[PDB]
Amino acid sequence: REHWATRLGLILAMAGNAVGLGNFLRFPVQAAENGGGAFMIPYIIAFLLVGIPLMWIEWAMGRYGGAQGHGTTPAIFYLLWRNRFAKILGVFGLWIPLVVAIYYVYIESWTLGFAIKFLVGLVPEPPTDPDSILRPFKEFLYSYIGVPKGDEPILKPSLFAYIVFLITMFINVSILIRGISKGIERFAKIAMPTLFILAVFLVIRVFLLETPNGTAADGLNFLWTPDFEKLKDPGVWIAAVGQIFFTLSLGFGAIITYASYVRKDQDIVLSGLTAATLNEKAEVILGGSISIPAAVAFFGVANAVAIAKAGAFNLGFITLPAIFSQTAGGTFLGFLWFFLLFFAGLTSSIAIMQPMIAFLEDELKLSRKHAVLWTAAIVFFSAHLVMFLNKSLDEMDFWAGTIGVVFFGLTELIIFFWIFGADKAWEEINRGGIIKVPRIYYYVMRYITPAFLAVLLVVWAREYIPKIMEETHWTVWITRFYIIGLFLFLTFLVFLAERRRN
Ligand SMILES: CC(C)C[C@H](N)C(=O)O
Ligand code: NA
Ligand code: NA
């Protein structure tokens, strides 16, 4: 095989893959925790030396594998490098997107549930004291996802949240089951424009927010005012790189799978650059101009930063709607906010489930319908772990969405640009390109990028190896045990797929 119908649809599909919850939730938090402008320099650099090259690399690998009827890494890694271990490493191209999808889709169902409740107007009703304004919404969120009073391991999701999660899964399925061109592409051409429009509107509305405590203006200033005292802080660089990986959907095997449906002769250079650029625009210009400026507007910079450090969902699901509730038509404004998050998340969720679907179709020769339904079944079932187990979400997001993507990014780059050959890879990347990659990026891909990632991983491992063993909560061990099981499961499927070939 299936292919993208038009170039536009391809672009919007890829853009739909990248632009998501990571733009309007993760980014604002990351940028706020790291000192605003101080975070932007490493962010941009990371975008130039990591995001772009890896994006092109994944597009290339994707199309390359797609030409031979393989959209997933287990097979592609083998095409690029002949080895059993290459397939084993390729398993991550399925494990990562699957694990991430498990909790990602659940968070997506959250945005949907909130969108509905805010649309219908069922929300907490605040009365000049910040806590008296935020508390109702904190209780609102906690009641929705069933957060425990103290630090208790069990979550008690409301019936509504559960039902909404089912609906979300259904929507994802209804889109995925129609295929690449008919299902994903069609929806992209609608969801994306809608997304951009809503984002712009929100940006403007938020912009107009001004109080005795501050202005959205001050927030934007805080975000775009350079600070170089933080450039000696490794944590900032690590956070920047992590954000780049997450937002561009790098290391998730999603880009590759999407790229495998691009015709062998079609350009991946300009298309890839456009998709990445669109994402960054949606991230720094749109995402960073909504939450932070609003928080700063009402509570000021210091408090806004504190709120950001408080949590990832605290700014998006609590603070912002609480701020909106204090303005005329603030309930409807909250709805637009959660409808935006839902479309952004939906366009991404379908992208991280596709790798699994593509593997079942290509390697196990399953029909699209069956592949989708089973993928949905697996995700839905596994989701109960994230739904009822506290801290499970964070564990999955860490192992898969943080460490895994970087490790996998390094792995894929090493396999493609080193083992498979640098020149053959470069030639494969530039082939059919409407425009050609700057020569300098050849030396960036072959030397700079892998070294940077390697160093990053080394640093990470050092701090984490001791902490892992000494962790008190059982919920995390359960999660670890289960996801390890998923890995074995996928490895087994790859084994079967391998045997069927012979
Ligand atoms: C896992 C990825 C599909 C996440 C997506 N790139 C986002 O920014 O939300
Ligand atoms: Na998206
Ligand atoms: Na993104």
Side-chain angles (χ1 to χ4, degrees), residues 18-20 22-23 246-248 279 283:
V19 178
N23 305 29
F246 191 91
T247 197
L248 291 180
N279 181 85
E283 180 127 308

Side-chain angles (χ1 to χ4, degrees), residues 106 144 157-167 380 384 387-388:
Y106 186 49
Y144 187 89
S158 64
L159 179 58
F160 180 69
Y162 189 84
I163 300 180
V164 170
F165 179 66
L166 260 173
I167 300 179
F380 174 80
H384 288 75
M387 295 193 300
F388 296 98

